[PDB]
């Protein structure tokens, strides 16, 4: 399948109560492997998955120095961004940055991305050609002009097409037993009477990885997104994921309904009936 | 791996 690496930076000002708080995490696919919290005691980049810990001490010295360096620049950014919008020094504000690279089933570069956000709003993003910027407002135009003069995109394109994918493949090979597996969803179905003439059918998908999954309900074989309810896929907290989908049906008619589970760990999609 | 280059808005 496809694979990906993403880093997430969040920094939150707290005026009158110290420096902003900076947190960084890195993911491969749907699996966290590093974290950094500028309030935690160790002041170090830390491993969050078993395969990254065989990198050696130089990786961690390396990544810690860099993550500390970028923690300072989002600190400055909060100052700068408050000036661009002429907001007061009193209010707490947040800054986010995401970037990463995608890789295909043959492990070659697919796409790259690098975007910035201010108080939960899109501020500037690297377009798909990795050569020009999408800036939203007028304050972002300044940032766009600064980054254009600085050739930031050329530098970012070199990372995303080189360092990034190469290290993704490295992680993908060192984490082979966790990152390249497919756990088929364990499935069951539950039935709860609601009235004396209505009943809820819940279709369950447990213990599946990766997180992409499709749960669909049909009535007599025709898709039925009418009286349904479909919860967000959630982490199980041991690396696997969980999902369910429910439909309320008139009692005496449960056998007309089918749930269809589509997942990559399933050679053929799964039909379940009560 | 984190990207090295330090950018500012």
């Amino acid at each position: 399948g496809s694979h990906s690496m993403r880093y997430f930076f969040t920094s939150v000002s707290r005026p009158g109560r110290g420096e902003p708080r900076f947190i960084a995490v890195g993911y491969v696919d749907d699996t966290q492997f590093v974290r950094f919290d500028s309030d935690a005691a160790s002041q170090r980049m830390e491993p969050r998955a078993p395969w990254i810990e065989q990198e050696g001490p130089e990786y961690w010295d390396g990544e810690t120095r860099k993550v500390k360096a970028h923690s300072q620049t989002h600190r400055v950014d909060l100052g700068t961004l408050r000036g661009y919008y002429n907001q007061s020094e009193a209010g707490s504000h947040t800054v986010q940055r995401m970037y990463g690279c995608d890789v295909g089933s043959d492990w070659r570069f697919l796409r790259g991305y690098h975007q910035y956000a201010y108080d939960g709003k899109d501020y500037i993003a690297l377009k798909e050609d990795l050569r020009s910027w999408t800036a939203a407002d007028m304050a972002a135009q300044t940032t766009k002009h600064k980054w254009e003069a600085a050739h930031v995109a050329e530098q970012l394109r070199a990372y995303l097409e080189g360092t990034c994918v190469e290290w993704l493949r490295r992680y993908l090979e060192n984490g082979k037993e966790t990152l390249q597996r497919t756990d088929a969803p364990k499935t069951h179905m539950t039935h709860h009477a609601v009235s004396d003439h209505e009943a809820t059918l819940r279709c369950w998908a447990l213990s599946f990885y990766p997180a992409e999954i499709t749960l669909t309900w049909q009535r007599d074989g025709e898709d039925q997104t009418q009286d349904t309810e479909l919860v967000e896929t959630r982490p199980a907290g041991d690396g696997t994921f969980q999902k369910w989908a429910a439909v309320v049906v008139p009692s005496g008619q449960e056998q007309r309904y089918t749930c269809h589970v589509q997942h990559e760990g399933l050679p053929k999609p799964l039909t379940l009936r009560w | 791996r984190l990207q090295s280059l330090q950018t500012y808005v």
Partner: T-cell receptor
Amino acid sequence: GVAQSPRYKIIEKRQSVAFWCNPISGHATLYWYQQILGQGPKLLIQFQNNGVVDDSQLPKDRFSAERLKGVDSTLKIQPAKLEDSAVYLCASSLGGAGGADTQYFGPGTRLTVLE
Amino acid sequence: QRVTQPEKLLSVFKGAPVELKCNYSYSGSPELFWYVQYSRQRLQLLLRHISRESIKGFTADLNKGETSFHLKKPFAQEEDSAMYYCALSGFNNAGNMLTFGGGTRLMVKP
């Protein structure tokens, strides 16, 4: 362009001296460089907005710099040594990437410290 | 971020080829620049690696095996007489700080 004052300066050793630098309007990165005769410029201190980014190769025992409002900056030598005779260059960048960017230089301040 | 310009002085005739050496030693991620200062003029940028640009007839190519960024030009002109400085922006240093080489004076005899 970048402005610097004064252009030339003679002082006796163990004395003090202050250089002044006005960046190009709106540049968030400001640099102080020392350029000794026969050598390239050597970075003293780098500012982003009003904060210090790189203090490392700055003699803190005698050199001190300030950019309180993230515009103009002042560098001070107290007290001066003979080895401080050099051209002191300030410079600035738009600031989107600090020193990984074009740096625009002032004319410099030729300091001459004498016995 | 060592930047080594081996020659201090380079003397050539108008219309002869120009090669200003630059080697560098940096364990991290670098960006490479050449800066120039014409006489009674300010230190100013000449070119940047990642711009893939040619300025005033000048080209330089980053060789990562040889860790070099030599400045080359096939036909020297008198307007080219100036001081040249190799520079390294080091991304693993705070603020991607810049380290200059020692300089090479270029004299193009008329």
